[PDB]
């Protein structure tokens, strides 16, 4: 029997089977319904498009995003996203597969129950479990104590974890993530003179970001190299055939993580967030958090991020302090990977929430078996 692992994380959902080292399905967390009724005619009681097919038809559809900040907000839409992942992306009967699911930090109590009611009542799984995204990411690096920085599409989180437990008094949420960066890249490339302003143009910039942006080790130094050399300018072939060139924009976009002001945001950068998070913990565990900063997600996926963070936290931490940033190359799907390891561990078989338990105790059973 195979267990399913679904990371409903921010904008992109990662699903697949436990044991595998990669998800089989990744797709946007997007639901659209017809804008006008004339398009439902003769379409067999279908009413909805979910995921990729909803992005292709955004012209004929009104799109809704249920988990833009990692917290589910529309449960009617989230059921359709889950139907789509079980029946269409995975091509599986969820009643045959125990399902490990994933939740943001500081997820409100009501939401864990609702998730559990739907997973059991609507899809009729035999077992289920809920883990915190950042904790699984720690597990995928073989740790149970550290501080994870989880950053995907719409939300960034610094999560101190001690012995498998996310410390609720030090969790910090940053409302600056991948999609805030793709928009800045557009702005600054439009300021050079190449125009990116339509929804189809955003998607182009999202590719140039993922393929050509990196994190400078010293912002000021790299700017100098750019203005005094061409070594770093790179070229990109556009869909029309046009070749645009990318200069200092390649590193000025991910700089917004350490310098959020570039976007009109007065909050602090992902390095000071890490410090601040670590300072809301007992000094008696900080040594362990410093030595185990784990980077996680699609926004952590820029060349040179780990070297940079090491240098920034080294400048905020005490002098005598072993600082280690861990940022695997598979770091984009590190949550999902933690899920697959956990769900395929022998001892976790005893740790599922069973259909029997759900019928006996109701959706609140989630609070007693999933910390």
């Amino acid at each position: 029997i195979a267990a399913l692992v679904i990371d409903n994380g921010s904008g992109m959902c990662k699903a697949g089977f436990a044991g595998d080292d990669a998800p089989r399905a990744v797709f946007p967390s997007i639901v659209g319904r017809p804008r006008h009724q004339g398009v439902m005619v003769g379409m067999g009681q279908k009413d909805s498009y979910v995921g990729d097919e909803a992005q292709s038809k955004r012209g004929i559809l009104t799109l809704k995003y249920p988990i833009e900040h990692g917290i589910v907000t529309n449960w009617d839409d989230m059921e359709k996203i889950w139907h789509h992942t079980f029946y269409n992306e995975l091509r599986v009967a969820p009643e045959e597969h125990p399902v490990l699911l994933t939740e943001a930090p500081l997820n409100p109590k009501a939401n864990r129950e609702k998730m559990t009611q739907i997973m059991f009542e609507t899809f009729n799984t035999p077992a289920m479990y809920v883990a915190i995204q950042a904790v699984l990411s720690l597990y995928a690096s073989g740790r149970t104590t550290g501080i994870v920085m989880d950053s995907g599409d719409g939300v960034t989180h610094t999560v101190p974890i001690y012995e498998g437990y996310a410390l609720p008094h030090a969790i910090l949420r940053l409302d600056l993530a991948g999609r805030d960066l793709t928009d800045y890249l557009m702005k600054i490339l439009t300021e050079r003179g190449y125009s990116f302003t339509t929804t189809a143009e955003r998607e182009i910039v999202r590719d140039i970001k993922e393929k050509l942006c990196y994190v400078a080790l010293d912002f000021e130094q790299e700017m100098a190299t750019a203005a005094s050399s061409s070594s770093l300018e790179k070229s990109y072939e556009l869909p029309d055939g046009q070749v645009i060139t990318i200069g200092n924009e390649r590193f000025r976009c991910p700089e917004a993580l350490f310098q959020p002001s570039f976007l009109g945001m007065e909050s602090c950068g992902i390095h000071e967030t890490t410090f601040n998070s670590i300072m809301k913990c007992d000094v008696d565990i900080r040594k362990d958090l410093y030595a185990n900063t784990v980077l996680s997600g699609g926004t952590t996926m820029y060349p040179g991020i780990a070297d940079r963070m090491q240098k920034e936290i080294t400048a905020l931490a005490p002098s005598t302090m072993k600082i280690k940033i861990i940022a695997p190359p598979e770091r984009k799907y590190s949550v999902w990977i933690g899920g697959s390891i956990l769900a395929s561990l022998s001892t976790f078989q005893q740790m599922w929430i069973s259909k029997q338990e759900y019928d006996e105790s109701g959706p609140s059973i989630v609070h007693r078996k999933c910390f």
């Binding site: 149970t144 001690y162 498998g164 001892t347 989630v366 609070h367």
Partner: protein, 346 residues
């Protein structure tokens, strides 16, 4: 059944966990045959009173006398683990959750049994024995929370007033609280539960800063070496002596009253609940000051028999702590498997 064997594999397992886990396994497998009704009621009473030695023995003298209806494979591990069980005052986490839950129950109870008439009467006794620098309590007590805020203000009488009383103790002189100033730390955990400890999600409290207190392991005969089953919050309470000065005045002025035992118990009981909930102290950190014979002499002469907050059903709390200990311990088991898997792929 397999789960419990995996939980008994925990290195951190304490006397509390064993009692909780073992009774959990005895209650599932045996079911609710009423013959055993009493064993279960009795174990829970022994647990509350921290008589772990009697309960582990009774538990083991029940697993052998019913092995036919039990797994003898599991009884084996229970008996091997038992002689090695300790309790760690700095890490008695399952009990820290139990007492925190019990305190909320004790309050719910006295809220359903109290005309807060005793507390309105105590105000006169407080004003009499209060220091010149304490505020007179003038308002009337209508809520139980106002009754809490009143009794928890008797701490202004501390370090003066209660000194003739504290000085007659032989127990308090073995308090183990370190003078070291460690400041405060953030926490979202209720009661005497520790800040970095794992918790149920419907058992959090809004984040506030809480006191970091350290044990002085050099105190010869220290309370925490003497009562390792008590969780260390702040060692012994000397504000308990302060309640005593006020209580002595009250008993003196209401001796003729026929319902005085009921009333003094309501105060002792709200004080005990409040101290755990507020995180100030653990239960035995307060009860083990009050039970000292010199202070109990004050109650015996007034013919007041304290119940010390003992209720009739600690059942809900006992059960929620079983869920907590299974959770903690398969968690630990699971963490041991993962680590091993990564050490074989490293």
């Amino acid at each position: 059944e397999l789960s419990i064997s995996l939980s008994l594999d925990s290195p951190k397992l304490d006397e509390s966990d064993f009692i909780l886990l073992s009774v959990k396994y005895l209650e599932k497998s045996l079911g609710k045959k009423k013959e055993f009704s009493g064993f279960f009621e009795d174990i829970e009473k022994l647990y509350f009173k921290q008589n772990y030695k009697e309960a582990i023995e009774k538990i083991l003298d029940f697993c052998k006398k019913n092995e036919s209806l039990l797994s003898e494979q599991v009884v084996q591990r229970l008996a091997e683990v038992a002689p090695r069980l300790k309790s760690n005052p700095k890490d008695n986490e399952s009990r820290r959750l139990y007492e925190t839950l019990y305190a909320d129950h004790l309050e719910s109870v006295i809220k359903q049994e109290s005309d807060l008439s005793v507390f309105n009467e105590l105000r006169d006794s407080y004003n009499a024995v209060k220091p010149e620098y304490a505020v007179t309590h003038e308002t009337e007590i209508k809520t139980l929370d106002e009754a809490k805020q009143f009794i928890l203000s008797f701490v202004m009488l501390n370090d003066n007033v209660e000194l003739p009383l504290k000085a007659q103790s032989e127990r308090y002189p073995k308090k183990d609280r370190s003078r070291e100033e460690l400041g405060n730390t953030p926490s979202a955990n209720p009661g005497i539960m520790k800040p970095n400890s794992p918790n149920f999600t419907d058992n959090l409290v809004p984040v506030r800063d809480v006191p970091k207190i350290a044990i002085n392991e050099k105190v010869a005969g220290g309370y925490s070496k003497t009562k390792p089953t008590t969780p260390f919050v702040a060692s012994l309470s000397g504000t308990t002596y302060s309640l005593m000065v006020v209580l002595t005045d009250y008993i003196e002025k209401h001796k003729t009253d026929k319902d005085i035992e009921k009333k003094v118990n309501q105060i002792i009981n709200l004080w005990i609940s409040s101290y755990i909930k507020e995180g100030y102290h653990s239960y035995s950190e307060v009860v083990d000051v009050l039970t000292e014979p010199f202070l109990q002499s004050i109650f015996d002469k007034a013919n007041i028999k304290l119940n010390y907050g003992v209720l009739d059903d600690t059942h809900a709390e006992f059960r929620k702590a079983q869920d907590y200990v299974f959770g903690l311990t398969i968690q630990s088991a699971m963490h041991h498997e993962l680590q091993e898997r990564f050490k074989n792929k490293e």
